[PDB]
Amino acid sequence: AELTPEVLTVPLNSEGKTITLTEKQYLEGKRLFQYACASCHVGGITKTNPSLDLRTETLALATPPRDNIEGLVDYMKNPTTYDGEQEIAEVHPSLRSADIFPKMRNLTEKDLVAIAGHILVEPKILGDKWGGGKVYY
Amino acid sequence: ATNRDQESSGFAWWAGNARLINLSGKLLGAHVAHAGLIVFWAGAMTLFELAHFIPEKPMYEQGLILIPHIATLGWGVGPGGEVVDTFPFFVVGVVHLISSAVLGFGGVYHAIRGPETLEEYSSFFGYDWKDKNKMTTILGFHLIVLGIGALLLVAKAMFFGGLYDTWAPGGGDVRVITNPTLDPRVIFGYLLKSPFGGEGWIVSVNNLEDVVGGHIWIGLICIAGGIWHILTTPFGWARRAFIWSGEAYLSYSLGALSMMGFIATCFVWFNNTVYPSEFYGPTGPEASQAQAMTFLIRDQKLGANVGSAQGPTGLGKYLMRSPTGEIIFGGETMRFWDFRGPWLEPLRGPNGLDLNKIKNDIQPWQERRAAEYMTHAPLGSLNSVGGVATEINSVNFVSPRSWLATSHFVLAFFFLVGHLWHAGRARAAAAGFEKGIDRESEPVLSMPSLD
Amino acid sequence: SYPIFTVRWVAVHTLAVPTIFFLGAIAAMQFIQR
Amino acid sequence: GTTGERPFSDIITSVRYWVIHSITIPALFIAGWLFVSTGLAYDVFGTPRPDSYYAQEQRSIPLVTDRFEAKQQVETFLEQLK
Amino acid sequence: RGWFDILDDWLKRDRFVFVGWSGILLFPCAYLALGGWLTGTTFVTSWYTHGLASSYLEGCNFLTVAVSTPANSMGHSLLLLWGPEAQGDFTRWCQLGGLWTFIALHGAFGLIGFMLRQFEIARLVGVRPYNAIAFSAPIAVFVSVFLIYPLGQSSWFFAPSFGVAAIFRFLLFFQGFHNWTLNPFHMMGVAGVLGGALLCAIHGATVENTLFQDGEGASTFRAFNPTQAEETYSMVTANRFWSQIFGIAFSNKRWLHFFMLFVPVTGLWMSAIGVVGLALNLRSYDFISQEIRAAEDPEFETFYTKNLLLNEGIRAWMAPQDQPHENFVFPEEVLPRGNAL
Amino acid sequence: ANLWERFCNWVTSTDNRLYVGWFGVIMIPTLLAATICFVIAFIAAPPVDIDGIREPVSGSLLYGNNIITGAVVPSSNAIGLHFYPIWEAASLDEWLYNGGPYQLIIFHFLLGASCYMGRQWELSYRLGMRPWICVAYSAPLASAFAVFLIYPIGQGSFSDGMPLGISGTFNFMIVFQAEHNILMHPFHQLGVAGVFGGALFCAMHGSLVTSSLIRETTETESANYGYKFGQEEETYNIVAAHGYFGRLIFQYASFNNSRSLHFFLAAWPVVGVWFTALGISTMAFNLNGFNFNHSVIDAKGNVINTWADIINRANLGMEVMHERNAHNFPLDLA
Numbered sequence A: 001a002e003l004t005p006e007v008l009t010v011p012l013n014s015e016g017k018t019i020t021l022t023e024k025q026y027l028e029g030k031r032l033f034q035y036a037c038a039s040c041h042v043g044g045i046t047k048t049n050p051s052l053d054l055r056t057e058t059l060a061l062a063t064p065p066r067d068n069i070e071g072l073v074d075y076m077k078n079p080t081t082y083d084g085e086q087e088i089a090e091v092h093p094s095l096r097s098a099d100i101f102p103k104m105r106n107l108t109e110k111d112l113v114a115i116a117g118h119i120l121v122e123p124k125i126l127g128d129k130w131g132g133g134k135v136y137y
Numbered sequence B: 001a002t003n004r005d006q007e008s009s010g011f012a013w014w015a016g017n018a019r020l021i022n023l024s025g026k027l028l029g030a031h032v033a034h035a036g037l038i039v040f041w042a043g044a045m046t047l048f049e050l051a052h053f054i055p056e057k058p059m060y061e062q063g064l065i066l067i068p069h070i071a072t073l074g075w076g077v078g079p080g081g082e083v084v085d086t087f088p089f090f091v092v093g094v095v096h097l098i099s100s101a102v103l104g105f106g107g108v109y110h111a112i113r114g115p116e117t118l119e120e121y122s123s124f125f126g127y128d129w130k131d132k133n134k135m136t137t138i139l140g141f142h143l144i145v146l147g148i149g150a151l152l153l154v155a156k157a158m159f160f161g162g163l164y165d166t167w168a169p170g171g172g173d174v175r176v177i178t179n180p181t182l183d184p185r186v187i188f189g190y191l192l193k194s195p196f197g198g199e200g201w202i203v204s205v206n207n208l209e210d211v212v213g214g215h216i217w218i219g220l221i222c223i224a225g226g227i228w229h230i231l232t233t234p235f236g237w238a239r240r241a242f243i244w245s246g247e248a249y250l251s252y253s254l255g256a257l258s259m260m261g262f263i264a265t266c267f268v269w270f271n272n273t274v275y276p277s278e279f280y281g282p283t284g285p286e287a288s289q290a291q292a293m294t295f296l297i298r299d300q301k302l303g304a305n306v307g308s309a310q311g312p313t314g315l316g317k318y319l320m321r322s323p324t325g326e327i328i329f330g331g332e333t334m335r336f337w338d339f340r341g342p343w344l345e346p347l348r349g350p351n352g353l354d355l356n357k358i359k360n361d362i363q364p365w366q367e368r369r370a371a372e373y374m375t376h377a378p379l380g381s382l383n384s385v386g387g388v389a390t391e392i393n394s395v396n397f398v399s400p401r402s403w404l405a406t407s408h409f410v411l412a413f414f415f416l417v418g419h420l421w422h423a424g425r426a427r428a429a430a431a432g433f434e435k436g437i438d439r440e441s442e443p444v445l446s447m448p449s450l451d
Numbered sequence C: 001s002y003p004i005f006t007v008r009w010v011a012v013h014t015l016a017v018p019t020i021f022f023l024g025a026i027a028a029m030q031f032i033q034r
Numbered sequence D: 001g002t003t004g005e006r007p008f009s010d011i012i013t014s015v016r017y018w019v020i021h022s023i024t025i026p027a028l029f030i031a032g033w034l035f036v037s038t039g040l041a042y043d044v045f046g047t048p049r050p051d052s053y054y055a056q057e058q059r060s061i062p063l064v065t066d067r068f069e070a071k072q073q074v075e076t077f078l079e080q081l082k
Numbered sequence E: 001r002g003w004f005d006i007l008d009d010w011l012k013r014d015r016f017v018f019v020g021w022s023g024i025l026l027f028p029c030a031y032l033a034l035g036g037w038l039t040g041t042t043f044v045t046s047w048y049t050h051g052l053a054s055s056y057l058e059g060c061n062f063l064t065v066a067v068s069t070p071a072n073s074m075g076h077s078l079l080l081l082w083g084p085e086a087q088g089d090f091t092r093w094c095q096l097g098g099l100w101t102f103i104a105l106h107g108a109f110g111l112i113g114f115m116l117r118q119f120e121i122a123r124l125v126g127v128r129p130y131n132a133i134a135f136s137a138p139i140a141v142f143v144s145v146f147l148i149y150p151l152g153q154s155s156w157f158f159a160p161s162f163g164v165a166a167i168f169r170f171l172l173f174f175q176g177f178h179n180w181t182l183n184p185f186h187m188m189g190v191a192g193v194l195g196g197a198l199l200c201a202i203h204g205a206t207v208e209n210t211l212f213q214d215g216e217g218a219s220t221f222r223a224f225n226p227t228q229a230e231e232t233y234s235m236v237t238a239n240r241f242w243s244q245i246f247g248i249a250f251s252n253k254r255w256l257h258f259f260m261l262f263v264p265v266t267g268l269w270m271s272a273i274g275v276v277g278l279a280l281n282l283r284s285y286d287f288i289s290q291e292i293r294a295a296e297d298p299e300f301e302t303f304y305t306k307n308l309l310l311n312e313g314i315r316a317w318m319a320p321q322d323q324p325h326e327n328f329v330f331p332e333e334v335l336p337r338g339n340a341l
Numbered sequence F: 001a002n003l004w005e006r007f008c009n010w011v012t013s014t015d016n017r018l019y020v021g022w023f024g025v026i027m028i029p030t031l032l033a034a035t036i037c038f039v040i041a042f043i044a045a046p047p048v049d050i051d052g053i054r055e056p057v058s059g060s061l062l063y064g065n066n067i068i069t070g071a072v073v074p075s076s077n078a079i080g081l082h083f084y085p086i087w088e089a090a091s092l093d094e095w096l097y098n099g100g101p102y103q104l105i106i107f108h109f110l111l112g113a114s115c116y117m118g119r120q121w122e123l124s125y126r127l128g129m130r131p132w133i134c135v136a137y138s139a140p141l142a143s144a145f146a147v148f149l150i151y152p153i154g155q156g157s158f159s160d161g162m163p164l165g166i167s168g169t170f171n172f173m174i175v176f177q178a179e180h181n182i183l184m185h186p187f188h189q190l191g192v193a194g195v196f197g198g199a200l201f202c203a204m205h206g207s208l209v210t211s212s213l214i215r216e217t218t219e220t221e222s223a224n225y226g227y228k229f230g231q232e233e234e235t236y237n238i239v240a241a242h243g244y245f246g247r248l249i250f251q252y253a254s255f256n257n258s259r260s261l262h263f264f265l266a267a268w269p270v271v272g273v274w275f276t277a278l279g280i281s282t283m284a285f286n287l288n289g290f291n292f293n294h295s296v297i298d299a300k301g302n303v304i305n306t307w308a309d310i311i312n313r314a315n316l317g318m319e320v321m322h323e324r325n326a327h328n329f330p331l332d333l334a
Ligand code: CLA
Pocket: B136, B143, B191, B192, B221, B222, B223, B224, B225, B226, B228, B229, B232, B233, B234, B235, B238
């Protein structure tokens, strides 16, 4: 197996347009995901709320849908609860809260997109392992 | 061949620094050159840390152990422990590294070029290990130097910009200390606290006033003790009690260093006052308490009544009582209920955690600090994979509290061994049997049989 | 007047020359990318 | 005593020793390096390259499950990589 | 002289590395076991036998490389290179696990050769062959663990693999499946190894600290001449020290050094016997009286029952990947788990 | 002389059958208190709530244990690192329930064992010996401090100290592996080299001296009677032993200096056990064994398991089952 562009092709938006990442953007999104998100999200779970993972099926049923680059980028700017009813920037890192979450300050729009791609590409590779927790280690 | 070989000095190459025991100038050279290495490392490492420092990450995510010591002293840091100016770190690093060159120069001068023995060049600098007068004099001088150094910390806290106070109202800040604690019932109370749980001996010191106060006492005690030893010579009970030799004096200090290494180990692991968790990461207890807080908050948000939630064992799922009744977080963290921290104390009432404050007064900064600390618990692997032993690779993290505790336990333990080694040898050498038993007068052969 | 080729000579070279070969192989491995 | 061979301390300090081994040691190092860099060690031992562990869309391991059809089994796995 | 007598002369020549008749067995097998392990940890996979990378070439490090055991479908095959499985195909041989039997079997004969070397050299120099006798315990261990144990199981798959972390997996397998810590033969093994290490340290320390002063220097090593007649330390002062410190002491130097032979050797032999039992799954797994009570009394708990719960965790969580040929599929809901974790 | 000097001479007397000494003045009462409490607790002590969850573990023979399963059980997790003398309990019954005897035993014992070490120094000084036997004993003593004192400190509870029992030791070992991967920690690998090597060199030196014993008896008697306690001559030919062992390997892999040989026997297991004690003591602060979980991935990013990933699957089984009722939250941070 290898990292082909078919693997690196993920939904751009909810309307069905896709986008194909390069190997460079994938590795970039993984490095940045470790830098800013892995402390809570290692392997696709959420340490401080194990009820929400980063599985694409889960991201799909979020309000608004989060199984696409724009949906994820938007979450990293203005994150909400699973149902969209509340904004959680005060307790979740985002560009909106880069004063209280300093690791977000240096991030740029290209960075959030790489992180989003990594999240969307990773369960295509790892399968159940992404978001499955210790059972699949 | 001025010693420098086994035949003339009596010591093999692998014990060669013992050739220096009665060469005070060559010995002085060794000590100053070694001091050069200590100051060198302090310099190079800070600059290394500064080169690798990214101010948007927490210090404890970056493998820093020296920059956290400078930040704690008030330099380069603002409210919350945020880094505002890296220039003092650079100054501290550069100045140490420059100094090591002059130390190193004087060390190499004395070890190579200088007089091998100081006693003929100067009656003030030369010494004999057995001169109980000259030895307490040198001790006295270094005591004064130490008291002065303790006062330097006091000068910094009271007159020269203060110290970082994790406890400072509003989330931590630099603070001038103006009322150090002088009451000796408080200062020496710390020495009489039990070292067991909920007391913590001197490791429990939790406010900068007591820290500055205790350094006033120590500085004055050291200065006065230095004078006392400059002026006096040891009394008869002390003369009969000790071994008076170079190696003996070495072994006393090895034991002393060992004791201090073990205390530092416990300080860096438990104390979050002079090791602020903003710079060093949470303590072990702190992260474990923060986990229970995290999930109290998440579940309370979902509508759970945390005060009445009976867990599986019959004990409270979130809250329970310590053995003296205080309300405490439940689960395994019940062992950590002695923890105290700026982010948790606002929830504390007279009986422990206050259920009304828990239901009403938890602020987003507390939920943030508790989530940050739970996810930066000092667990991690030797290759710096963060987390419990079963975690997968991803997070590149080991708490500096782990790095600092483990390293100094190892050093403290080996120095205890060094104490035993040199103390037993110094005794045997002073009595004249460190090289073995004399065949013509074997002591056991002149004793009666045990049976 | 020592010999050069002894049983001892065979012993060290049965070990030494494979060892060096294996080291270069392991060296090259550090530059393999996935 | 001495079993008659030349002392090692004498050989490694000799010039003739290093004239010979300034070539043989680096030559053997280079030979081993080439062994891996040509990709030849994969083929001699049947070790998967990073791309030849799985097929593109399979997550099942090519475990051999028969004693006497085993060599046949491995070769069948190797052709599903193409 | 005959040609046999002349070959005997040259084999027994005094040279840097003694050869002997035993060398004809020892040097080819020991070198080939050694070489096969190096070769396999450097270059050979365990992908088709275990679903594991196992070589430097695959990016394993020193702790995780191994020459792994053949696949379970091989049973107890000799896995000869020219046998029916590989059919002379060296590459397929490596892929099927042949270096494992290659290393195991050559190493067995290498160990035989080394013991014969101990007999041979002792016979020529003139000493009693107690060293060869002591080496029976390593052999008993190697044979029981690497050969007998798998021969009792379904296949070579369950023998130990030749690697650092592979042996650790073996350790943990024996805890979770065999309850091997509970076995009295392993306990005697532990007592003999820990007791041997104790004797090693205490005897070495006692001699170093009852030396006679036979020189003027502070380094006491030069005050010993290997041709001297006299004892270099005081047996009398050592005896009194230990009598008064510990209550008893050695008084007979010959018994002292026989005891040092006896203790670790007997220990390893006893552990060997226990592993032979484990070949048959003849474990000391349970205490029936505890199980009868525990089953009737939900408040009865000991460290014995707590450890069986740990064993059940090891088995269910490690079996699917450790025995891949079994196609174990354990849905999440059947996995044994305590609260939260 | 007066009474204090007569006492001091008796205390330090080299004529007592067992040496007392100033260290022995502390060692005897503490070792007696610990021993008497241990024996009574192992036979008769009722069940102990080790994990603070009101789920007592029965450790004593009278409560259904045997020699192998019995233990003095560590004190309750509710206590953590608090000092729990008898006089802090409201009754001996309360004291028994919460595992009081464990604290009393291990503190008296650590104190007495420390003085045992010091006593080894003391008698060596009265006897005119070189002083470093006590240094050798520091390796087991440090090991004992590690599992009874340091490790409960870093984990914050005496309930995670090692149980005083045979099955409880194994429980300690298994939980330790799951939480620190001690097998993958080089200080433990050093400790294995220390004891395996120690046992090896024990057997080697015993077999080599035995092999070169000088014929001093006939075949119908023990060769041990060839040695007479106090004899000046040696009873074996170390040259013969060198000649044998040098040819077994090669000439310079073999010792010919008895002092060098014996110091090597002392240094090897001592240093190794120092390292394994330091291994427990630093894993007390959660600096754990190497973590190579999912270290190998392929061109696509599939995880390619190694033997370390298999070890992790066994670790995970120990993690999820140990103290099955004690955790309410997803991480086991201490
Ligand atoms: C580096 C620090 C240092 C060192 C190495 C020494 C070393 C020495 N001092 Mg000096 N001293 C110092 C600092 C130091 N001093 C300071 C700062 C002061 C001012 C307080 C003094 C005041 C002082 C006086 C007044 C005297 C000495 C004396 C001595 C000698 C006897 C040592 C002795 O018996 O030990 C201590 C060993 C003992 C057996 C004494 C009992 C101590 C007990 C066992 C310890 C517990 C009590 C402790 C003090 C407090 C409890 C703390 C606890 C909670 C941890 C020795 C040369 C004596 C001497 O000969 O003077 C010329 C003497 O009379 N010193």
